[PDB]
A paper describes a structure:
The cylindrical shape is formed by four stacked heptameric rings, with the two inner ones composed of β-subunits and two outer ones of α-subunits. All active CP subunits are initially synthesized in a precursor form with N-terminal propeptides (β1pro, β2pro, and β5pro) that are autocatalytically processed upon CP formation.
Remnants of a tryptophan- or tyrosine-containing octapeptide stemming from β2pro can be seen in proximity to the β2 active site. The late-PC1 was resolved to 2.7 Å, whereas the late-PC2 was resolved to 2.3 Å without applying symmetry during 3D reconstruction. Although the aforementioned octapeptide is located in both halves of the late-PC1 and late-PC2, another distinct density is found between β2pro and the octapeptide in both sides of the late-PC2 and just one side of the late-PC1. We conclude that late-PC1 is an earlier assembly state than late-PC2 and that the octapeptide represents β2pro remnants. Our late-PC1 and late-PC2 structures suggest that during β7-driven dimerization of two 15S half-proteasome precursor complexes, the maturation process initiates with autocatalytic activation of the β2-subunits. An unidentified density was observed in the complex with remnants of β2pro in just one half of the late-PC1 and both halves of the late-PC2. We speculate that this density might be remnants of β6′pro or β7′pro, which were cut by the active β2-subunit, as it was already suggested in previous studies.
Author numbering:
A (entry chain 3): 1 to 125, 132 to 148
B (entry chain A): 2 to 242
C (entry chain G): 2 to 206, 209 to 248
D (entry chain 5): 3 to 113, 116 to 143, 163 to 267
E (entry chain B): 1 to 249
F (entry chain E): 1 to 250
G (entry chain 4): 1 to 39, 41 to 78, 80, 85, 115, 118 to 276
H (entry chain F): 1 to 234
The structure:
């Protein structure tokens, strides 16, 4: 029953915390070239000096969804949140469009956002990566 | 029947049809009961048939009429598990609409929402449609008395009056003849009791052989509340002509 | 036709007649289980189970065939043992959560609806299997005594008397006779005697058997679910043996 | 008339033969064992009707059953073939028609063929009427058979074995003269437990009077082997940790 | 894991054809007839209403939908897919164009967005293609009036006049013999009524056919006065009384 | 009573009617397709020996690596699919180095073998309850030879099923049957290191199609003081010549 | 696992995935049949013949018996297929060992080889013992020409099925035989056995071959556990 | 034949209402060697017969220690035995760490049943194929439990599982009143267990290599005897 998102800070760090981009030469260290972030961005710099509202905005919709699921569990039972989560997971897992980033129509219907617009909708948004094969590897887990 | 696929999932056949949707449609007549919905001047009446062949059953626990919100009632044709699933989802939809937009959910908007969910089920491969037919009745603050029906294919539409069941054709023909005679798309009565009696009379003359107070279920929607009648109320309505 | 070829290899598939054959196969699995009955009296419920005798190595007090979902809710089931255990655990979780949230024992219809929704959700996807159990549960709440039966399809109903398992036909016939012979109602002790009689009569299959009975009545157990002590169980067994021979 | 079932989808023809040989066990007796060079070899016990009637094997010193057997019904004068295993390869199908079936037909001066089709594998569009279930024919793609208007097909694909059987029978340089007509009964079905499907197929074949001498069947009887179709006959009671 | 993917529901047949798209086209061809006629002063879009029973209120369900005040659409095929795609198009008109440029999109760009949405359903692992065909009529400042047809595969083409549905071939021939570069909006409406008269088996009156026009701006439909530069909607749906009056004449 | 087709041997998570997993059996069959590896454990060290199957004479002699060093006190021999053995060897090396990092000691040979077997279990549920990592069982078998202070010199056999055994002598690969029979006949607890080397060479020569020489066979040993070493071609050739002279003496 | 693939519909199981003799499936002619040539040998010199498959090799230890090769049965098919079928002898007993392989070898070769062997052996009526496996039986079976212990729907197929068919309904009816059948699982040429079934096979084979129990059982046990094909993953998978 | 069509996975019922993959998993227990468990009011013991790959190999471990007051013995698959033993160890450790409490044997059985039932109703995995015998001593005394991988747990005074375990079970049934009263004498109970497991031997003799014993009790922490430690009980 949370309104404002809570527990947004990291509690542990490591040099292999990002499994997607790890060096093949030294598997315990991240791959700076394939990160494509400017090459001078250590992970430690991401732990300080953030805008206070950024974490609230990034996790807002997930928090509202979790509160709705908790209310359904309290009032309806386990089956209702189970079914909602199953529907959403099936819809999300069957969609794979490497050339587009827009959400599906059915996802919007399930989220009850058929006729709703937020700034995420208006503003949806290299040398290495950003290709179809990287998305294939990330999606399949290989 | 389906040759290869189309026996499990909802994809097109060579004829351009969705066999799983049609089979879900055929699944709606398993209960072999009928329901009727009519509009009054300021009320909407739904009457459903009760069949309790088993003598060990508790009759008071058998019902296909559900209360969705303060103003909306629903009648389901089909097996009771999918009926209860649909009822719970409709309750959640109405409550969320009220929370999100600041006013009560209208009957037609809820019908459209359920139909959109049904469209999801008809297009996704790993989802099956619910083999039920839903009928929502209310007295909308803008549109007056309202009856809207939704089916497994995702199609929804509003009705002056409607009937659904294995014997829906006879009731539909009788209603059409009556509305031809009266030239009015509703019932000209000032109380919902007269409308209930008229619906009971229509059901009796359409199905035949009549019934007692325990073979019927009646729900009535007014401008303020939707409520289901009890056995004594139905007995009074049967006695009163 | 009982066997639908081409439409019985997946859970969430409609047949051309609008039937779900995996649920019906689960029903057939239920119909082979041990006989269980439930009877609703004027102020409570009685449950009876035809237990099959086993090796002497079993600890006598650690193998009970009637499960207590909560202090006012008791249930029995026929079908697959793991499915029954899973459903009993889910029912206990639901009752505990309801009592924590609303500071009162859960009403029987609310419990029945939650259990039925959980069962029905397992007929929706091809990655799960319908439950192979049918459950007879009941108890007492502020509105009185309630007895329900729940099927693998998620369909549940309230009953005056319910029977499941191999000997379901004879048990149902005896329950119908009992209901007909008592239009006014029934008492808890008469219900226990008749439950013993019905369990004894329904048995028809060289194998010795024992009987378990359970009460939940306002006047007898203060609205709580209890087992049967030696005296009442012995009296009911004597009545049943007189009925048989 | 000789009834030749084919090893097809669901083993429906073979199962139907079982019905025909157990529901009317009085009229049927074991006659002969054919050569099984082109089949997968088979040895097993003697099957008997479930209801307790006498075995179709009247000989007392025979205790084994082979892959390919021929039964005879003198009251109706009908020959039936029961085949336990499929052909070693489709390539030898021709041989099976030429060196086995035709010599038997010539030897006994016999004056139908039972089959099933799977709709998902219809790559030539021979199913023109999916509404109906059965097809009856009498005598790329071929049009040598005359199917009834109520059949689901009007032609046969060249990939089907029935076309090869027809070609071998018609083009045989020394085919028996006593052979007059060919009948072909086929059904559309799906794999699974096809006992009731086979019963309905046999009922349709008998009702249509495809074979004149075939009498109607009222009480259907299974053999005793079908009791082991799901494994041990009393296996469910063994698993006390699962069923209760 | 074997659930991190799902195989494609639309694949190439050996002849080089996508079977699901062809079956969706068949489903479209089994639908009710709809048509569009493009004139010098406007575009007419028309269709035949259908009802499961006479007791249904045909005005509750409308096959003609306003996408923007200057763009409307009609259909042939399956209704729920229509409803889903219309809602999506109405949302996309705002998210992609009006929240960026302050103005509604031209007809062609909205058609392109709808067609992209439809195409993404033919390269998926868990949705079938939309079994529906679209007619979109519109007007914009730098392109004038336009009429487009969108197919289930996501291909769209501009037409001077066209029809889709069960009676599409005969309607196409009748429109071929009755179109010219100097037609007017009223002439187009009359031709559309005549063409629909050849396809409706039952009652051809104002309660069984549905028409809408893209014509001149209607300041009486704005809902407010005071701004001379605010143009009214050009999309207008004809009432049943107007259709009856035109049929009588 | 008809002959149909059974399909219980195609999925790793499907039981046969008698409760068997046939994909594991077929993985063992894949193991038997590889070359032969023999290990003999004595009181003076453990000897490992492999046969190099060179399909073409153009293949580099020092390219087939059937014997690897997991750690200074632990060596391994492999038979089966080399691609899977590569991953298994990488995991074993990582485990040994991590144990040294966190405990400042050598890891027990049995602990390393158990870790490798826990990795091999990954086609199903993991030992600690982890989700499935791969789609099929490995097609390799390992012989792990080591020495530690707790248990002396040990030789373990690790299989794709996730189970390992302790052996006095063990042969895997194509010619494993005759080699294992010879090991059963010719092993005793009082063997020396040189006798073990000669026995390994003799059994390899017996079970090898080609004439045994320094280029199609490889020897290695692990001892407490010198650690794990792989003999060069000159030492193995000298051993082969001594074996030939001993055979020709009779 | 959220779902299972929609397109994983099982193939109908009335078809056995057996090797194809010829690539041309549209042929209208008669496919050629393999020719079998049987060896020089003195059949009367041996009073007993044993017919079985390779999976039963541990039942016949080499050193304990006097197993010596005498010749090879030659089977040739041209459409070109060639095979060799070595024959062994110990004491006065013959041994025909068949190498089944459901991937590489068609059953037609087994049928023809069984026909040739039975035709050659029927001219002298020796003692015939058949040892084989079946996937359709519940427990071990001992059968003769007078009694069949199989209950329906159990049956025997494969090369041993071919041999029994030739001995029962072939052109050489009446030859007495003893058949020992053990339960197994797996495709032909890749079967597996239980340890108890292996022990029962060893005991009954020793009793029928007239050898001392202890030494024969020891040798057979050692051969069974020496990475035999029938004990593939038993030790490592079950504890 | 008809069973062949409906035994693909654990989410399929046959038309007669049978779940064949679970039955096959239950049948997988017979491929393992025999283990016996028994107990009295004071002590609980397990006896196991171990098997080796061949003469040159070691013997398999059949008894695994979970906690100072609880242990188990296996019959069936090796991977599932490893998984379930590790899971029970984790649960005991969690109980001790969070509550300073000894995990009850009944609680462990319930947790095992809950974990086992899941794999028999969802697609993508397989049911477990190992039977377990769990002995322990807690605040309610001595406990013996039999876990069947269908997801079932039974509480008994004595039992046996594995290949040819029927003879040992019959012997335990016949002499229940004798060993049920052996209180304060661990040796007598262990010898009774050895005699019980001797009924299941076929052409085999118990040696110091193939016999493993485990005991737990009021003052006895769970202890495993192997090798010469069992020579006195032969």
């Amino acid at each position: 029953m949370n309104i404002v998102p809570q527990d947004t800070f990291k509690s542990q760090v490591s040099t292999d915390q990002d499994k997607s981009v790890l060096s093949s030469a030294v598997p315990s260290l991240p791959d700076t070239l394939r990160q494509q972030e400017g090459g001078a961005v250590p992970l430690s710099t991401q732990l300080n000096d953030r805008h206070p509202l950024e974490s609230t905005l990034k996790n807002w919709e997930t928090t509202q969804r979790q509160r709705q699921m908790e209310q359904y569990r309290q009032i309806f039972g386990i089956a209702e949140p189970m079914k909602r989560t199953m529907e959403m997971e099936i819809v999300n897992r069957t969609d794979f469009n490497p050339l587009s980033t827009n959400g599906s129509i059915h996802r919007d219907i399930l989220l009850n956002k058929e006729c709703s617009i937020d700034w995420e909708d208006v503003y949806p948004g290299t040398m290495v990566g950003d290709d179809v094969h990287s998305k294939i590897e990330k999606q399949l887990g290989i | 029947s389906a040759a290869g696929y189309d026996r499990h999932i909802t994809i097109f056949s060579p004829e351009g049809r969705l066999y799983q949707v049609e089979y879900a449609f055929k699944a709606t007549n398993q209960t072999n009961i009928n329901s009727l919905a009519v509009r009054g001047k300021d009320c909407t009446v739904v009457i459903s048939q009760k069949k309790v062949p088993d003598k060990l059953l508790d009759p008071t626990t058998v019902s296909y009429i559900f209360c969705i919100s303060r103003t909306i009632g629903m009648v389901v044709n089909g097996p009771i598990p999918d009926a209860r699933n649909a009822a719970l989802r409709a309750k959640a939809e109405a409550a969320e609409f009220r929370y999100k937009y600041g006013y009560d959910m209208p009957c037609d908007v809820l019908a459209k929402r359920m139909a959109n969910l049904s469209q999801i089920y008809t297009q996704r491969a790993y989802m099956r449609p619910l083999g039920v037919i839903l009928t929502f009745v209310s007295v909308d603050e803008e549109l007056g008395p309202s009856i809207y029906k939704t089916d497994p294919a995702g199609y929804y539409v509003g009705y002056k009056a409607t009937a659904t069941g294995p014997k829906q054709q006879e009731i539909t023909t009788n209603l059409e003849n009556h509305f031809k005679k009266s030239k009015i798309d509703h019932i000209n009565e000032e109380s919902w009791e007269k409308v209930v009696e008229f619906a009971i009379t229509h059901m009796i003359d359409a199905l035949g052989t009549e019934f007692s107070k325990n073979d019927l279920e009646v729900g009535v929607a007014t401008k303020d509340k939707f409520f289901t009648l009890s056995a004594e109320n139905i007995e009074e309505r049967l006695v009163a002509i | 036709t009982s066997i639908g070829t081409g439409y019985d290899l997946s859970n969430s598939v409609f047949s051309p007649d609008g039937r779900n054959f995996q649920v019906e196969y689960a029903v057939k699995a239920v119909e082979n289980g041990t006989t269980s009955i439930g009877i609703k009296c004027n102020d409570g419920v009685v449950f009876a189970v035809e237990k099959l005798i086993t090796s002497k190595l079993l600890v006598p007090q650690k193998n009970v065939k009637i499960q207590v979902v909560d202090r006012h809710i008791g249930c029995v089931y026929s079908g697959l043992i793991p499915d029954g255990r899973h459903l009993v655990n889910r029912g206990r979780e639901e009752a505990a959560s309801f009592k924590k949230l609303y500071k009162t024992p859960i009403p029987i219809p609310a419990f029945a609806d939650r259990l039925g929704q959980y069962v029905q959700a397992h007929t929706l996807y091809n990655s799960v299997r319908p439950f192979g159990v049918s459950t007879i549960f009941g108890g007492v709440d502020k509105n009185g005594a309630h007895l329900y039966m729940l099927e693998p399809s998620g369909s549940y109903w309230g009953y005056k008397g319910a029977a499941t398992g191999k000997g379901r036909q004879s048990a149902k016939a005896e329950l119908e006779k009992l209901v007909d012979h008592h239009p006014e109602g029934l008492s808890a002790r008469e219900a226990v005697k008749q439950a013993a009689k019905i369990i004894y009569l329904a048995h028809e299959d060289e194998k010795d058997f024992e009987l378990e009975i359970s009460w939940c009545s306002l006047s007898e157990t203060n609205g709580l679910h209890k087992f049967v002590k030696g005296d009442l169980l012995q009296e009911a067994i004597d009545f049943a043996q007189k009925e048989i021979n | 008339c000789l009834v030749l079932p084919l090893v097809s989808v669901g083993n429906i023809p073979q199962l139907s033969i079982d019905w025909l040989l157990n529901s009317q066990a009085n009229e049927w007796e074991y006659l002969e064992a054919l050569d099984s060079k082109y089949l997968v070899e088979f040895v097993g016990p003697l099957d008997r009707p479930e209801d307790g009637s006498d075995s179709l094997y009247k000989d007392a010193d025979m205790k084994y059953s082979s892959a390919l057997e021929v039964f005879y019904n003198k009251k109706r004068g009908l020959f039936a073939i029961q085949q336990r295993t499929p052909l070693v390869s489709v390539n030898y199908l021709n041989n099976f028609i030429v060196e086995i079936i035709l010599p038997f037909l010539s030897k006994y001066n016999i004056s139908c063929i039972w089959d099933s089709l799977y709709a998902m594998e219809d790559e030539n569009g021979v199913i023109v009427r999916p509404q109906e279930v059965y097809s009856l024919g009498e005598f790329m793609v071929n049009n040598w058979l005359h199917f009834t208007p109520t059949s689901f097909q009007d032609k046969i694909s060249v990939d089907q074995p029935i076309f090869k059987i027809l070609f071998q029978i018609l083009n045989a340089s020394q085919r028996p003269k006593a052979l007059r007509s060919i009948k072909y009964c086929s059904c559309l079905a799906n794999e699974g437990d096809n006992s009731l499907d086979s019963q309905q197929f046999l009922q349709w074949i008998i009702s249509q009077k495809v074979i004149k001498n075939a009498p109607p069947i009222v009480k259907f009887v299974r053999p005793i082997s079908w009791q082991g179709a799901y494994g041990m006959a009393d296996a469910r009671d063994k698993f006390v940790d699962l069923y209760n | 894991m074997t659930d991190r993917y799902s195989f494609s529901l639309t694949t190439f047949s050996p002849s080089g054809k996508l079977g699901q798209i062809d079956y969706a086209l068949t489903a479209v061809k089994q639908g009710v007839t709809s048509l569009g006629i493009k004139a010098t002063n406007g575009v007419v879009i028309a269709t035949e209403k259908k009802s499961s029973s006479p007791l249904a209120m045909s005005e509750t369900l409308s096959k003609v939908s306003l996408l923007t005040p200057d763009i409307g659409a009609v259909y042939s095929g399956m209704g729920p897919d229509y409803r889903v795609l219309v809602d999506k198009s109405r949302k996309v008109a705002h998210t992609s164009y009006k929240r960026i440029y302050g103005e509604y999109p031209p007809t062609k760009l909205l058609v392109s967005e709808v067609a992209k949405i439809m195409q993404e359903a033919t390269q998926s692992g868990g949705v079938r293609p939309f079994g529906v065909s679209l007619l979109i009529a519109g007007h914009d400042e730098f392109n004038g009036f336009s009429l487009y047809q969108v197919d289930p595969s996501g291909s769209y083409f501009p037409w001077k006049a066209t029809a889709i549905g069960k009676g599409s071939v005969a309607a196409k021939t009748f429109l071929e013999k009755r179109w010219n570069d100097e037609l007017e909006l009223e002439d187009a409406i009359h031709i559309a009524l005549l063409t629909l008269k050849e396809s409706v088996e039952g009652e051809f009156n104002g309660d069984t056919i549905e028409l809408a026009i893209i014509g001149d701006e209607n300041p009486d439909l704005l809902g407010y006065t005071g701004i001379p530069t605010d143009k009214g909607p050009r999309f207008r749906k004809l009432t049943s009384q107007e259709i009856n009056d035109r049929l009588e004449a | 009573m008809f002959l149909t087709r059974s399909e219980y041997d195609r999925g790793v998570s499907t039981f046969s009617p008698e409760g068997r997993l046939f994909q594991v059996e077929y993985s063992l069959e894949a193991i038997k397709l590889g070359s032969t590896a023999i290990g003999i454990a004595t009181k003076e060290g453990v000897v490992l020996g492999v046969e190099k199957r060179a399909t073409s004479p153009l293949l580099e002699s020092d390219s087939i690596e059937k014997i690897v060093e997991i750690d200074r006190h632990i060596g391994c021999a492999m038979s089966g699919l080399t691609a899977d053995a590569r991953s298994m060897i990488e995991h074993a090396r990582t485990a040994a180095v991590t144990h040294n990092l966190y405990y400042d000691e050598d890891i027990n040979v049995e602990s390393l073998t158990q870790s490798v077997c826990d990795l091999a279990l990954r086609f199903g549920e993991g030992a600690s309850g982890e989700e499935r990592l791969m789609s099929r069982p490995f097609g390799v078998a390992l012989l792990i030879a080591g020495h530690d202070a707790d248990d002396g010199y040990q030789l373990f056999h690790a299989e794709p099923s996730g189970t390992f055994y302790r052996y006095n002598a063990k042969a895997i690969g194509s010619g494993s049957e005759g080699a294992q029979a010879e090991l059963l006949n010719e092993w005793h607890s009082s063997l020396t290191l040189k006798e073990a080397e000669l026995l390994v060479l003799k059994i390899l020569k017996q079970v090898m199609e080609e004439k045994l020489d320094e280029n199609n066979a490889q020897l290695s040993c692990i001892t407490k003081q010198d650690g794990f070493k792989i003999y060069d071609n000159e030492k193995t050739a000298e051993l082969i010549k001594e074996l030939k002279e001993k055979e020709a003496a009779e | 696992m959220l779902f299972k693939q929609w397109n994983d519909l099982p193939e109908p199981k009335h078809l056995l995935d057996l090797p194809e003799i010829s690539k041309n499936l549209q042929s209208l002619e008669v496919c050629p049949v393999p020719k079998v040539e049987f060896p020089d040998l003195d059949v009367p010199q041996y009073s007993t013949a044993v017919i079985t498959t390779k999976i039963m090799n541990p039942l016949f230890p080499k050193n304990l018996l006097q197993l010596t090769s005498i010749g090879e049965i030659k089977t040739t098919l041209t459409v070109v297929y060639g095979f060799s079928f070595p024959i062994y002898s110990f004491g006065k007993t013959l041994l025909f060992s068949m190498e089944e392989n459901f991937i590489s070898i068609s059953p037609i070769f087994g049928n023809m080889i069984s026909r040739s062997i039975i035709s050659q052996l029927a001219q002298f009526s020796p003692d015939i013992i058949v040892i084989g496996t079946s996937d359709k039986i519940a427990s071990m079976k001992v059968m003769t020409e007078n009694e069949c212990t199989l209950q329906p729907p159990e049956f025997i197929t494969g090369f041993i099925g071919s041999v029994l068919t030739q001995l029962i309904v072939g052109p050489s009816k009446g030859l007495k035989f003893k058949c020992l059948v053990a339960p197994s699982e797996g495709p032909n040429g890749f079967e597996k056995l239980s340890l108890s079934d292996m022990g029962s096979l060893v005991d009954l084979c020793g009793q029928w071959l007239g050898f001392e129990p202890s030494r024969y059982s020891e040798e057979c046990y050692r051969l069974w556990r020496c990475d035999s094909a029938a004990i593939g993953a038993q030790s490592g998978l079950y504890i | 034949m008809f069973r062949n069509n409906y035994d693909g996975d654990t989410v399929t019922f046959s038309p007669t209402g049978r779940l064949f993959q679970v039955e096959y998993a239950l049948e997988a227990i017979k491929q393992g060697s025999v283990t016996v468990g028994l107990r009295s009011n004071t002590h609980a013991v397990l006896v196991a017969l171990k098997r080796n790959a061949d003469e040159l190999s070691s013997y398999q471990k059949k008894i695994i220690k979970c906690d100072e007051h609880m242990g188990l013995s296996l019959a069936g698959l090796a991977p599932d035995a490893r998984v379930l033993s590790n899971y029970l160890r984790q649960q005991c450790n969690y109980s001790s760490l969070v509550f300073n409490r000894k995990l009850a044997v009944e609680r462990a059985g319930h947790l095992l049943c809950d974990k086992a039932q899941k794999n028999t109703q969802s697609y993508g995995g397989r049911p477990y194929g190992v039977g377990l015998l769990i002995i322990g001593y807690d605040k309610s005394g001595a406990h013996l439990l039999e876990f069947q991988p269908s997801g079932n747990v039974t509480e008994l005074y004595g039992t046996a599982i594995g290949a040819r375990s029927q003879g040992a079970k019959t012997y335990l049934e016949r002499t229940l009143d004798t060993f049920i009263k052996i209180d304060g004498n661990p040796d007598e109970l262990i010898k009774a267990g050895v005699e019980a497991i001797s009924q299941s031997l076929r052409d085999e003799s118990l040696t110091v290599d193939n016999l493993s014993i485990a005991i737990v009790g009021k003052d006895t922490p769970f202890t495993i005897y192997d090798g010469e430690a069992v020579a006195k009980y032969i």
